[PDB]
Write a protein that binds this ligand. Structure first.
Ligand SMILES: NS(=O)(=O)c1ccc(C(=O)N2CCc3cc(O)c(O)cc3C2)cc1
Ligand SMILES: [Zn+2]
Length: 257
């Protein structure tokens, strides 16, 4: 099955998921000079005060921090969005080295990692129905650079030892995702897709301009995770990013001048 290796990585995905070569695939390079400022774009509303994290899972591709999405608790609205989108999970993509790992790029710059906070449009009732719709998901993407530690990330980092291998989970309650946000909510936005199989073209992407800083030690701990299951040959969970895809007939809009 699909993964990030030589034999099952991004350049193979199209064989099982032909939408891989579609018209609105993600990620993309954000050409900052070509992105147009859109004065009609609203400030993003990130309302995470009542967020209820439940669990952290190593799914063999990344780790997901999962949230209770059975009520309007942690929601994303405004910005380019119409209606209310509920937080279901977050995860990261990262590299084997600090010079790569992000999925989106900014004028071809790769960041060390990229955080995806995944939300679904409440008008579709559940996540599985939402992914079948062109406006079903809103993914908030946040770049990570290596520098000072992110204190709000440390709780995540410290639990990774308990979910080293594929299919392991751990209780992960009371985690506040507000601690993963940068100061500014300036963003770029464009219509795109899931960046892993099934690659569904259901996402409004909202990518923050300002990266967060994490420490070298924090990202090193991401790189100790395993793609493999327990008692299988150790394959370090690194380079779990899809490269930039063709922009085709799309415009990237900026919320800021
Ligand atoms: N990298 S990204 O674009 O932010 C991204 C966001 C979300 C997901 C995701 O949670 N998935 C894929 C689609 C899917 C579809 C299902 O029907 C399902 O039950 C579960 C899932 C699980 C994967 C990737
Ligand atoms: Zn992702």
């Amino acid at each position: 099955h699909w993964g990030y290796g030589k034999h099952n990585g991004p350049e193979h995905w199209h064989k099982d998921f032909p939408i891989a070569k579609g018209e609105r695939q993600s990620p993309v390079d954000i050409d900052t000079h070509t992105a147009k400022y859109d004065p009609s774009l609203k400030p993003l509303s990130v309302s995470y005060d009542q967020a209820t994290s439940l669990r952290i899972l190593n799914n063999g591709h990344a780790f997901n921090v999962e949230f209770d999405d059975s009520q309007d608790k942690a929601v994303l609205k405004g910005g380019p969005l119409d209606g209310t989108y509920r937080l279901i999970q977050f995860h990261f993509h990262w590299g084997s080295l600090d010079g790569q790992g992000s999925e989106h790029t900014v004028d071809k710059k790769k960041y060390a990692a990229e955080l995806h906070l995944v939300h679904w449009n409440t008008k579709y009732g559940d996540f599985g129905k939402a992914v079948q719709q062109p406006d079903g998901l809103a993914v908030l993407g946040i770049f990570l650079k290596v520098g000072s530690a992110k204190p709000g990330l440390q709780k995540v980092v410290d639990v990774l030892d308990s979910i080293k291998t594929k299919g392991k989970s751990a209780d992960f309650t009371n985690f506040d995702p507000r601690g993963l946000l940068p100061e500014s909510l300036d963003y770029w936005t464009y219509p795109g897709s899931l960046t892993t199989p099934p690659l569904l073209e259901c996402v409004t992407w909202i990518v923050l301009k300002e990266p967060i800083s994490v420490s070298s030690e924090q990202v090193l701990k991401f790189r100790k995770l395993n793609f493999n299951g327990e008692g299988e040959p150790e394959e370090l969970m690194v380079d779990n990013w899809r490269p930039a895809q063709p922009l085709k007939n799309r415009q990237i809009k900026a919320s800021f001048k």
